[PDB]
Amino acid sequence: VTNQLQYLHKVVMKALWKHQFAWPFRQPVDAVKLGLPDYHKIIKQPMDMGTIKRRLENNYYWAASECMQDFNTMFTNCYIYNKPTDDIVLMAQTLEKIFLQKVASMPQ
Amino acid sequence: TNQLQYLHKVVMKALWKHQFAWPFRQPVDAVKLGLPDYHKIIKQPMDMGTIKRRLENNYYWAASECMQDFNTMFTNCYIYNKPTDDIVLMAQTLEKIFLQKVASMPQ
Numbered sequence: 001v002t003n004q005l006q007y008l009h010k011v012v013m014k015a016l017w018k019h020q021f022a023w024p025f026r027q028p029v030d031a032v033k034l035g036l037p038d039y040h041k042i043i044k045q046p047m048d049m050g051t052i053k054r055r056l057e058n059n060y061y062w063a064a065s066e067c068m069q070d071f072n073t074m075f076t077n078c079y080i081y082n083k084p085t086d087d088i089v090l091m092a093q094t095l096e097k098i099f100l101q102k103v104a105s106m107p108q
Numbered sequence: 109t110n111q112l113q114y115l116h117k118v119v120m121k122a123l124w125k126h127q128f129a130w131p132f133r134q135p136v137d138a139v140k141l142g143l144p145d146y147h148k149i150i151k152q153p154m155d156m157g158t159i160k161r162r163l164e165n166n167y168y169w170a171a172s173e174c175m176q177d178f179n180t181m182f183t184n185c186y187i188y189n190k191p192t193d194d195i196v197l198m199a200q201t202l203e204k205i206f207l208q209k210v211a212s213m214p215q
């Protein structure tokens with residue numbers, strides 16, 4: 001495992017997975033349970049922290065930028081699909097600032 | 109610093125000359141663009157021109173500050189615009205370059 005994927009796993013994933021705002025992102029958006037039959041029509045590449053966490057556990061990624069895109073897609077889906085005033089956008093914004101903070105200090 | 113210098117000369121240069129960068133090079137003009145509700149939804153406007161000026165006048169203290177500004181620019185676009193607007197796609201494309209370039213920032 002590269003230095004960077006190790007960093008994304010041990011520093012970034014560790015910080016975001018246990019955050020108090022993380023629960024809505026720990027598993028794929030359930031459009032039935034959440035009652036949103038337009039979600040999969042708007043968001044065509046769903047993404048979530050469980051998938052990224054699993055992929056980091058199973059050495060699915062070949063480069064750090066690959067794991068970094070997944071994080072970006074997860075956040076960007078939220079800002080694209082949700083109303084500007086939904087609390088989830090603000091939770092997503094808080095997590096993403098931590099993501100960016102951490103990645104500013106990723107090795108190499 | 110070395111991280112701020114990299115964001116200026118590697119990251120910002122690549123993003124600035126891109127064929128999709130032109131809507132992001134200067135602040136959104138809600139008058140000239142007919143968007144009288146832009147500033148009611150978007151309370152912190154941001155744009156590459158601002159970020160570049162700040163890089164040049166030593167406004168930033170740490171790299172993460174400047175990257176935070178990049179993100180706000182992209183997020184404002186996703187939040188304000190309809191999912192189907194071409195500008196969302198131009199944002200995502202530029203944002204992938206940003207993330208790629210940021211992954212190779214010297215620590």
Ligand SMILES: O=c1nc(Nc2cccc(Cl)c2)oc2cc(Cl)oc(=O)c12
Nearest residue numbers: 023024025029030034077078081082088
């Ligand atoms: O991305 C999203 N993920 C979730 N997850 C979620 C929400 C409540 C419980 C559980 Cl266990 C998971 O909630 C959302 C709600 C809405 Cl309206 O839009 C969204 O885009 C998202």
